[PDB]
Amino acid sequence: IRLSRSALGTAERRDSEVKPAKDLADIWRVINEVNTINLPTFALYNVERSQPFNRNIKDNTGRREERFDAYSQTLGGAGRFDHFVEWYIYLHKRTVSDISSSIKELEQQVNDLQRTVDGGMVSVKSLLEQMKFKLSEAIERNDAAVSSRVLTESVQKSIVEKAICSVVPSISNIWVEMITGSDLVKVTNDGHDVTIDQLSDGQRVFLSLVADLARRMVMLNPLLENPLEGRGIVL
Amino acid sequence: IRLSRSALGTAERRDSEVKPAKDLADIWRVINEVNTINLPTFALYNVERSQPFNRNIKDNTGRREERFDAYSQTLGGAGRFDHFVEWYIYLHKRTVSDISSSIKELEQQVNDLQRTVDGGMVSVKSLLEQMKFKLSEAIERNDAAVSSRVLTESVQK
Known part of the structure; x- marks a missing residue:
């Protein structure tokens, strides 16, 4: 695949050769729609990360729950940590x-x-x-399930929590509180239960990267026992 | 109680008398501040209640409800739908x-x-x-300020 561009005010414009990438992605998309497959993860974490605050707006952007929301702003430079928080609260609501x-x-x-x-x-x-x-x-309130009772959302939440706790050194646990009825996410730094907005720059940026990557891996790899073992390219 | 106003540029300005209304409201306020009493409600629902109001209310539900928040925006944009939904969800989360x-x-x-x-x-x-x-x-202690005693969130929902 070749990306080409000509400078402003040039009579001859150079074209891009992007057809093989379209062919490979067409294979992926068609096979996935016919029968669910594991999709690759493409993420870019540039300097535009480390931005302050989290969950700035309600962000009416396309139902974070659906699978193909993992490709939204994935190569923008800054991971959508607000999307991760919304998805995590979604998972907590589904679980409880x-x-x-x-x-x-x-x-x-x-x-x-x-x-x-x-x-x-x-x-x-x-x-x-x-x-x-x-x-x-x-x-x-039961005797309608009897068997199974293994929620997929619970498995996704556990996988993401385990990844976050294992990669980030200071964070030991992460969960969602509903009492005090604004939805808020709390972590445990050095044995102290602290909310998501009182993190420092360096533990919040790294956590944002790890959480976004884990969310995209989990959402794009539903047929893997460990979704984080899926293939992809991360910058 | 008489509310008066004079046209701008007029030499003599008509004065409004609001002293007895202030006296009655002072009676209410003082009696409440000494011992909790039921207070009157004054609400205006104009035709602007149907308009979707924007307040940038995101995570605004810190919501330390005082007893006197019932008098806030009571004669203006009181009956809005988004505020009701937000408060109802907040209260249900607290009520569980x-x-x-x-x-x-x-x-x-x-x-x-x-x-x-x-x-x-x-x-x-x-x-x-x-x-x-x-x-x-x-x-x-929350209602130790005897002028700010409220009901529990379940007898309130």
């Missing part, structure tokens, strides 16, 4: 809003006080064994 | 297992997405049970 994906944590959460209230602390049961009634209520 | 006091946003913080991670952080309601005795010193 499924009875099958909530009864699993309800069952585990109930079988944690027994490991604690049995030893003592009679004050950690008044408003905590009431949550056992919620697990009992989940029985009548 | 409604516990939220000035302190219980921390109890729900340690009882949600915590209580499952390792590291000897099993502390749930344990460290702040002595702070839970400050709940009366906390939930009554």
Whole structure:
């Protein structure tokens, strides 16, 4: 593939030879639409990254949930970290809003006080064994899935969280809080739970790069056990 | 109460008398500031309520609701749809297992997405049970300003 351009005020204009790239991408697109395949990732992280703030506007831009949103502004120079935050909050809502994906944590959460209230602390049961009634209520809120109950969105969220925690040294965990009912993302830096906007320049920029790359890899590789092992080129 | 105005350039300006209205409003304000009382509501819904208003309200829901926020924009752009949707979603997020006091946003913080991670952080309601005795010193502290007592977010939704 050759990109060519002639200077201003030149009678003879040079053309570009981009046909083979179109042919290869046509192969990818046609095969993918007929039967889902793993798509390559093309990202550019130039100096336009490290911009301040996050999630500036609601960004009505095309439904971050859909797969081909991973190619939007992918080579712009600055990763769309607002897109990542919106997608992460989407994943958290999908995970916590499924009875099958909530009864699993309800069952585990109930079988944690027994490991604690049995030893003592009679004050950690008044408003905590009431949550056992919620697990009992989940029985009548269910019996429609019975089997499976393995959400794809939960797997994507876990993969992205593991990648973020493994690559970024200071960050140990990342999650979404809904109480105080603005949606906000919190991380753990050096053992301290801090929100996403109080990061420093160097831990927020690197996290933005890693999170955007992980999101695009996960969205473009749905048929891989580890989506981050997909192929692509990153600048 | 008489509201008066004179045309610009007139030698003599008509004066409006608003003293008795101020007296009644002072009665209301002082009695409320000593002991909580139910206050009147004055709302105007003009034809501009249907127009889609723009306020750049993104993450503006820090929303420390005081009792006197009901008098803000009450005779102007009061009944807007986007504000209702935003407030309703915010309140529903807060209302889920409604516990939220000035302190219980921390109890729900340690009882949600915590209580499952390792590291000897099993502390749930344990460290702040002595702070839970400050709940009366906390939930009554928000309305300790007796002029600003409101209902809970569930009796309000």
